[PDB]
Design an enzyme around this catalytic site. Structure first.
Site, mmCIF file in Angstrom:
data_model
loop_
_atom_site.group_PDB
_atom_site.id
_atom_site.type_symbol
_atom_site.label_atom_id
_atom_site.label_comp_id
_atom_site.label_asym_id
_atom_site.label_seq_id
_atom_site.Cartn_x
_atom_site.Cartn_y
_atom_site.Cartn_z
ATOM 1 N N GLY A 129 -9.711 -72.141 -47.618
ATOM 2 C CA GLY A 129 -10.280 -73.819 -47.707
ATOM 3 C C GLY A 129 -11.745 -73.904 -47.779
ATOM 4 N N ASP A 170 -12.010 -61.693 -52.015
ATOM 5 C CA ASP A 170 -10.502 -62.352 -51.532
ATOM 6 C C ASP A 170 -9.284 -60.652 -51.702
ATOM 7 O OD1 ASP A 170 -8.743 -63.162 -49.595
ATOM 8 O OD2 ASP A 170 -9.975 -64.849 -49.996
ATOM 9 N N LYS A 193 -5.266 -63.801 -55.393
ATOM 10 C CA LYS A 193 -5.961 -65.738 -55.025
ATOM 11 C C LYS A 193 -7.454 -65.778 -55.785
ATOM 12 C CE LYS A 193 -5.605 -67.758 -50.901
ATOM 13 N NZ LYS A 193 -5.741 -67.795 -48.847
ATOM 14 N N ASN A 210 -9.743 -55.257 -49.985
ATOM 15 C CA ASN A 210 -10.241 -55.774 -48.475
ATOM 16 C C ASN A 210 -11.139 -54.524 -47.888
ATOM 17 O OD1 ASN A 210 -10.351 -55.488 -45.804
ATOM 18 N ND2 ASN A 210 -8.452 -55.600 -45.533
ATOM 19 N N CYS A 225 -25.685 -60.330 -32.811
ATOM 20 C CA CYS A 225 -26.640 -60.267 -31.779
ATOM 21 C C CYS A 225 -26.265 -60.913 -30.450
ATOM 22 C CB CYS A 225 -27.746 -61.310 -32.419
ATOM 23 S SG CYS A 225 -29.329 -60.699 -33.683
ATOM 24 N N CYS A 251 -3.721 -83.833 -37.490
ATOM 25 C CA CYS A 251 -4.954 -82.416 -37.560
ATOM 26 C C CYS A 251 -4.551 -81.825 -39.549
ATOM 27 C CB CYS A 251 -4.020 -81.070 -37.064
ATOM 28 S SG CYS A 251 -4.665 -81.179 -35.257
ATOM 29 N N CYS A 268 -30.027 -54.126 -38.008
ATOM 30 C CA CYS A 268 -30.394 -55.542 -37.669
ATOM 31 C C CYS A 268 -31.464 -54.690 -36.198
ATOM 32 C CB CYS A 268 -29.616 -56.238 -36.361
ATOM 33 S SG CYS A 268 -30.612 -57.889 -36.052
HETATM 34 N N1 LIG Z 1 -11.209 -58.582 -44.739
HETATM 35 C C1 LIG Z 1 -10.928 -59.502 -45.677
HETATM 36 N N2 LIG Z 1 -11.933 -58.877 -47.240
HETATM 37 C C2 LIG Z 1 -11.655 -59.710 -48.617
HETATM 38 N N3 LIG Z 1 -11.308 -61.739 -48.002
HETATM 39 C C3 LIG Z 1 -10.809 -62.000 -46.939
HETATM 40 C C4 LIG Z 1 -10.870 -60.767 -45.286
HETATM 41 N N4 LIG Z 1 -10.791 -61.645 -44.103
HETATM 42 C C5 LIG Z 1 -9.605 -62.921 -44.718
HETATM 43 N N5 LIG Z 1 -10.047 -63.462 -46.156
HETATM 44 C C6 LIG Z 1 -10.291 -63.914 -46.530
HETATM 45 O O1 LIG Z 1 -11.096 -65.259 -46.476
HETATM 46 C C7 LIG Z 1 -10.292 -66.175 -46.626
HETATM 47 C C8 LIG Z 1 -9.930 -67.527 -45.317
HETATM 48 O O2 LIG Z 1 -9.153 -69.247 -46.147
HETATM 49 P P1 LIG Z 1 -9.167 -69.964 -45.105
HETATM 50 O O3 LIG Z 1 -8.485 -69.039 -43.365
HETATM 51 O O4 LIG Z 1 -10.092 -70.933 -44.503
HETATM 52 O O5 LIG Z 1 -7.630 -70.409 -45.767
HETATM 53 P P2 LIG Z 1 -6.138 -69.957 -45.058
HETATM 54 O O6 LIG Z 1 -5.855 -70.513 -44.386
HETATM 55 O O7 LIG Z 1 -6.043 -68.668 -46.133
HETATM 56 O O8 LIG Z 1 -5.249 -70.630 -46.220
HETATM 57 P P3 LIG Z 1 -5.055 -70.682 -47.388
HETATM 58 O O9 LIG Z 1 -4.416 -69.551 -47.951
HETATM 59 O O10 LIG Z 1 -4.182 -71.626 -48.060
HETATM 60 O O11 LIG Z 1 -6.554 -70.875 -48.163
HETATM 61 C C9 LIG Z 1 -8.782 -66.467 -46.880
HETATM 62 O O12 LIG Z 1 -8.920 -66.281 -48.429
HETATM 63 C C10 LIG Z 1 -8.330 -65.121 -46.245
HETATM 64 O O13 LIG Z 1 -7.216 -64.085 -47.433
HETATM 65 ZN ZN LIG Z 2 -28.371 -58.071 -34.794
#
Ligand SMILES: Nc1ncnc2c1ncn2[C@@H]1O[C@H](COP(=O)(O)OP(=O)(O)OP(=O)(O)O)[C@@H](O)[C@H]1O
Ligand SMILES: [Zn+2]
Ligand SMILES: [Zn+2]
Lengths: 231, 222
Positions: A15, A36, A47, A70, A149, A163, A221
């Site tokens: 998003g 991502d 993505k 990841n 922190c 929503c 930190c």
């Molecule tokens: N550990 C991680 N490493 C890389 N990317 C991540 C990690 N955790 C979350 N993300 C990514 O962060 C992004 C946040 O997107 P957001 O939650 O705003 O949209 P969403 O709810 O995933 O809906 P949509 O999949 O339609 O975008 C996601 O694409 C998710 O896969």
């Molecule tokens: Zn800190």
């Protein structure tokens, strides 16, 4: 002109991240690093690759580097830190800013661990699941509170059609304000906010700043803090 | 529910184009587009219908500042709603000039039509949205803009995006009846200040219809 000289890493191209990447692409940012681990017409392709294709067609002059891993795994966190340290517009130079647009605490905490070690400035951004609040936070390790922190801050807000309609609008506002802050920070004009909330129900934009916690759980930190107090 | 509403947008550049797109993505029932020099509004209609073909469109390219065209403009605000012969639910002014805004003001006072006015400065450093309920709050003629303070190759589209986003959120709150609709909300991009206020009508307003609507509103309260 000057925006062409900077590199920005975006973690999470969902998003807020995608709107943010699109806006920076249209501004003519020098380079975007996209991170991502999810897959999505491009319904099925990773993505980051899907984002890269859409964005490069928007502005072919923006250099893209995409990573599908990841970052919460130790192995992949090494690659992430390598790219943050070396993935700048000139290879071997740091990225100028990291933007967290991820959706979970663990990923945010992982970005925080990297940036405290590296001394990397970053912005953390979020939209709540209620779709009617969001925030941005600027984190300068050693100078402002880091993500560790204090526990997670929450913007106060408090049916189905509501929503569904509000969520993309809220994401758009938060992404817009995040991008304005990126530009103020990179281009050095106006005043960058350290924390800015958005309550969409009341058009309230709470702002503040947090000082670091001398007893932060993250030793790095604590270290950056010591180095800052010297200078 | 959002599919049941019609919104008129005057001005299809800048804030207007962002606003129309966002409403088009939300699946608003109908958009009426007015701008004046395939025309500007025809181009917009084409792009927008591609984004969400659930949305109905009506476009017009006449200069609403002439008396002859002003009658057509008022005709479409009164009758151009989702059901033909019903009023649009909201008029949005996203034009970048005083004469158009005042012209919209004059129509909305004559009709008792609630509308929102929006703007971004040339400098890109500031913008605002304003709700106007003729007879109940200050109209565009009631007072000049007095709220204080509220790179460009980058800041301008960003500021337009923030203003359009807040405008749209307020349109949704207005039509869908949740949260609180703001009456005046300013945006200062340099400082991240968001001044807000609401203003009563000017009982000596130059617009004869604003005065008429105020009398009507006071009459209903008692
Ligand atoms: N550990 C991680 N490493 C890389 N990317 C991540 C990690 N955790 C979350 N993300 C990514 O962060 C992004 C946040 O997107 P957001 O939650 O705003 O949209 P969403 O709810 O995933 O809906 P949509 O999949 O339609 O975008 C996601 O694409 C998710 O896969
Ligand atoms: Zn800190
Ligand atoms: Zn008036």
């Amino acid at each position: 002109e000057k925006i062409r000289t900077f590199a920005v890493a975006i973690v999470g191209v969902g998003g807020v991240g995608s709107v943010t990447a699109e806006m920076l692409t249209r501004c003519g940012i020098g380079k975007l690093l996209l991170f991502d681990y999810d897959k999505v017409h491009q319904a099925g392709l990773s993505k980051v690759q899907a984002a890269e294709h859409t964005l490069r067609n928007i502005n072919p002059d923006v250099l893209f580097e995409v990573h599908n891993y990841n970052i919460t795994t130790v192995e992949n966190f090494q690659h992430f830190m390598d790219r943050i340290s070396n993935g700048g517009l000139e290879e071997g130079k740091p990225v100028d800013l990291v933007l967290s647009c991820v959706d979970n605490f663990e990923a945010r905490m992982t970005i925080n661990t990297a940036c405290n070690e590296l001394g990397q400035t970053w912005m953390e951004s979020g939209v709540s699941e209620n779709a009617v609040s969001g925030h941005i936070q600027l984190i300068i390790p050693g100078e402002s509170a880091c993500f560790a922190c204090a526990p997670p801050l929450v913007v106060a807000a408090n049916r189905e059609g509501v929503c569904a309609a509000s969520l993309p609008t809220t994401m758009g506002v938060v992404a817009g304000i995040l991008v304005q802050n990126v530009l103020k920070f990179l281009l050095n004009f106006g005043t960058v906010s350290f924390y800015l909330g958005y309550n969409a129900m009341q058009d309230f934009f709470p702002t503040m700043s947090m000082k670091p916690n001398p007893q932060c759980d993250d030793r790095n930190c604590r270290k950056q803090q010591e180095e800052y107090k010297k200078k």
